């Protein structure tokens, strides 16, 4: 059974994601600051070399970060016990509908009220610079800080987060799932271990569990709104292509 589930998810998380909360918090409190157009261009020479209007370039650099995170989330998912045994079409469905929820949950760790890390913590981009972008690009930025400031007030650590992200992936009501039963049972196991973990990791936050359940539905809405802006950008900005990985994930979402 599952007295080992929490350890396996936690180990898979630390092993697969290049950035985590301890590293993020230590770095946040030195990284090159992008606060204006001239520092953007510096960072693009120095930090983003391998990766043309500014907003579009920023849009591009964000999506490169998603491509890489999706790559890490797939490897993390295969290490969740039970996941590799699902039908490959179900595996695809779970990652497709779950990756962005997981992405924004995790992005929260590198964000504070003033900005966020970039290029593996080698940089920091300020919240005000992001707000100065022209629409619609500015609009994909601030709602994430709004969400992050509130998710971060819960003071989760990496171990809570690993269980949380596993719960987001193994989610039994994604559309078109071939075998809901097996996935719902993975889910119940993870959510059970999560509940117990939050009890012993945070003994005085009586409502953290239900609070996190709520964060799940909130991330859902957050992704729906994000996906809608990305669709607007895609149909109305001739210079903003979406990476083909991102394009499959986003296809059919509404």
């Amino acid at each position: 059974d599952l007295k080992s589930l929490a350890k396996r998810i936690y180990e898979a998380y630390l092993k697969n994601f290049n950035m985590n909360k301890v590293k993020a918090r230590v770095i946040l409190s030195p990284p090159f600051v992008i606060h204006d157009m001239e520092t953007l261009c510096m960072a693009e020479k120095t930090l983003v070399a391998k990766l043309k209007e500014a907003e579009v370039r920023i849009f591009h650099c964000c999506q490169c970060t998603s491509v890489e995170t999706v790559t890490e989330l797939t490897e993390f998912a295969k290490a969740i016990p039970g996941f590799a045994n699902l039908d490959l079409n179900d595996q695809v469905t779970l990652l497709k509908y779950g990756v962005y929820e997981a992405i924004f949950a995790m992005l929260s760790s590198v964000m504070n009220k003033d900005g966020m890390l970039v290029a593996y913590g080698n940089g920091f981009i300020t919240r005000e610079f992001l707000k100065s972008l022209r629409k619609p690009f500015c609009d994909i930025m601030e709602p994430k800080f709004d969400f992050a400031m509130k998710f971060n007030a819960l003071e989760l650590d990496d171990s809570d987060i690993s269980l949380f992200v596993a719960a987001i992936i193994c989610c039994g009501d994604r559309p078109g799932l071939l075998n809901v039963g097996h996935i719902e049972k993975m889910q119940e196991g993870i959510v059970h271990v999560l509940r117990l973990h939050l009890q012993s990791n945070h003994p005085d936050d009586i409502f953290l569990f239900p609070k996190l359940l709520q964060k799940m539905a909130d991330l859902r809405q957050l992704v729906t709104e994000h996906a809608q802006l990305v669709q607007i950008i895609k149909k109305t900005e001739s210079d903003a292509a979406l990476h083909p990985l991102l394009q499959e994930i986003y296809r059919d979402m509404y």
């Binding site: 790559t71 990652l95 499959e248």
Partner: peptide
């Protein structure tokens, strides 16, 4: 979902 299937 060629590329997602590709990762998996």
């Amino acid at each position: 979902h060629q590329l997602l299937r590709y990762l998996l």
